[PDB]
Ligand binder design. Structure first.
Ligand SMILES: Cn1ncc(Nc2ccc3c(c2)CCNC3)c(Cl)c1=O
Ligand SMILES: [Ca+2]
Length: 118
């Protein structure tokens, strides 16, 4: 959609973005991504992952109106899942959570884009 690329985010749009974010935070499989990765759970994580991201950081940026275009919001969300699949092996519970939660996000994102005009 060109509106995703070109149209600045409005206060109305941010009500939808908060709804998408809350739906992910409530998802059963979102537990590994609610808060930043604890370095004591993964000692070399922050030397390996250049741009870490988590849902609590995105909650702060949504509240602060940090995002100006929908592309930037999708980019932050995608970092969460791409970081996880790059650091972890395919049989990790974190990796499997990233697979289900990203599919859930795409569903919710399609819903946000569809209703963005009404
Ligand atoms: C490499 N690595 N390590 C952790 C993590 N999340 C995460 C979040 C909370 C808790 C745990 C893990 C384990 C036990 N305490 C609660 C991710 Cl997503 C990751 O990729
Ligand atoms: Ca990526």
């Amino acid at each position: 959609d060109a509106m995703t690329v070109l149209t600045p985010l409005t206060e109305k749009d941010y009500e939808g973005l908060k709804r998408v974010l809350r739906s992910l935070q409530a998802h059963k499989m979102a537990w590994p991504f609610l808060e930043p990765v604890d370095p004591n759970d993964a000692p070399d994580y922050y030397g390996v992952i250049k741009e870490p991201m988590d849902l609590a950081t995105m909650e702060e940026r949504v509240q602060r109106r940090y995002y100006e275009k929908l592309t930037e919001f999708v980019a932050d969300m995608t970092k969460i899942f791409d970081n996880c699949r790059y650091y972890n092996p395919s049989d990790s519970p974190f990796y499997q959570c990233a697979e289900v939660l990203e599919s859930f996000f795409v569903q919710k994102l399609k819903g946000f884009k569809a209703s963005r005009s009404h």
